[PDB]
Amino acid sequence: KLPPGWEKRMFANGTVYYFNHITNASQFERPSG
């Protein structure tokens, strides 16, 4: 499902986003790569 290095992440207010654990990058939209 999810591409390499990405993992799902979430704010203290309950808002979900995406985080790259290899690069420390982050984004709201679901990652294609």
Ligand SMILES: *[C@@H]1OC[C@@H](O)[C@H](O)[C@H]1O
């Ligand atoms: C929840 O935390 C992330 C921020 O971007 C949103 O505006 C807030 O509601």
